[PDB]
Amino acid sequence: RERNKLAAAKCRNRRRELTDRLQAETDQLEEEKAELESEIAELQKEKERLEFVLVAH
Amino acid sequence: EKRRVRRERNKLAAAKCRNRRRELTDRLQAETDQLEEEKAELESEIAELQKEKERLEFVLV
Amino acid sequence: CRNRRRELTDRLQAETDQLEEEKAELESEIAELQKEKERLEFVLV
Amino acid sequence: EEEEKRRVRRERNKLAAAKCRNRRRELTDRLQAETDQLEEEKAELESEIAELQKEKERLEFVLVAHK
Ligand SMILES: [Cl-]
Numbered sequence: 001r002e003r004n005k006l007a008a009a010k011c012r013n014r015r016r017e018l019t020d021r022l023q024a025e026t027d028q029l030e031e032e033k034a035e036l037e038s039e040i041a042e043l044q045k046e047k048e049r050l051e052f053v054l055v056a057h
Numbered sequence: 058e059k060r061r062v063r064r065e066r067n068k069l070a071a072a073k074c075r076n077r078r079r080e081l082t083d084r085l086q087a088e089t090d091q092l093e094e095e096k097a098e099l100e101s102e103i104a105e106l107q108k109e110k111e112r113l114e115f116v117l118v
Numbered sequence: 119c120r121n122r123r124r125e126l127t128d129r130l131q132a133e134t135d136q137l138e139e140e141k142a143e144l145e146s147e148i149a150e151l152q153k154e155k156e157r158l159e160f161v162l163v
Numbered sequence: 164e165e166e167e168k169r170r171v172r173r174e175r176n177k178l179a180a181a182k183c184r185n186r187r188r189e190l191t192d193r194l195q196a197e198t199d200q201l202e203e204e205k206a207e208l209e210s211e212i213a214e215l216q217k218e219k220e221r222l223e224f225v226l227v228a229h230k
């Protein structure tokens with residue numbers, strides 16, 4: 001009853017740590033998506049600038 | 058009739074905790090795999106842009 | 119002929135200016151993607 | 164001397180004209196090289212956009228799909 005108490009406390013502590021680490025890593029994926037969305041926008045602008053130039057050649 | 062049910066209840070909560078830990082580790086690994094793939098893809102695009110810049114410098118000179 | 123060379127010379131200057139700006143845009147894009155790579159390396163402990 | 168000088172002047176013009184013709188050729192070739200670079204970079208951009216879009220799609224799948 002004494003060593004099961006400790007073992008169970010550690011398990012729940014490890015579970016809680018993983019739950020928090022997953023919330024944090026999910027936020028980063030959501031930030032990486034937004035950052036990709038802005039990189040996509042940037043390259044589409046350069047693409048239109050080039051299309052604008054090439055039509056005249 | 059209590060010290061048995063309580064022991065069974067504890068053994069089951071322990072299995073459930075470890076099972077939740079395993080599932081959280083798997084989900085974390087899937088998210089980490091995705092970040093590593095994104096990093097790999099960026100390294101690939103950088104290499105592609107750097108080559109195209111070199112080809113651009115070649116025609117300029 | 120003389121007039122042709124002059125026209126071509128001016129067209130080439132204009133197009134070379136366009137590649138010059140394009141080169142700078144690629145340097146910018148490379149710089150951005152390296153910044154993002156550096157951050158992911160960080161996020162990845 | 165006067166007459167000889169004028170002929171020389173004519174032969175130098177043949178030289179100049181030849182130099183001009185070859186300059187026109189060099190300029191045309193370089194203009195094409197530069198246009199071909201822009202055209203391929205436009206295409207490479209289009210492929211880089213499409214690849215970042217797929218990376219975003221794969222990122223979104225991980226965020227919303229669940230085992
Ligand atoms: Cl532990």
Ligand SMILES: [Cl-]
């Ligand atoms: Cl159950």
Ligand SMILES: [Cl-]
Binds near residue numbers: 084228229230
């Ligand atoms: Cl999952």
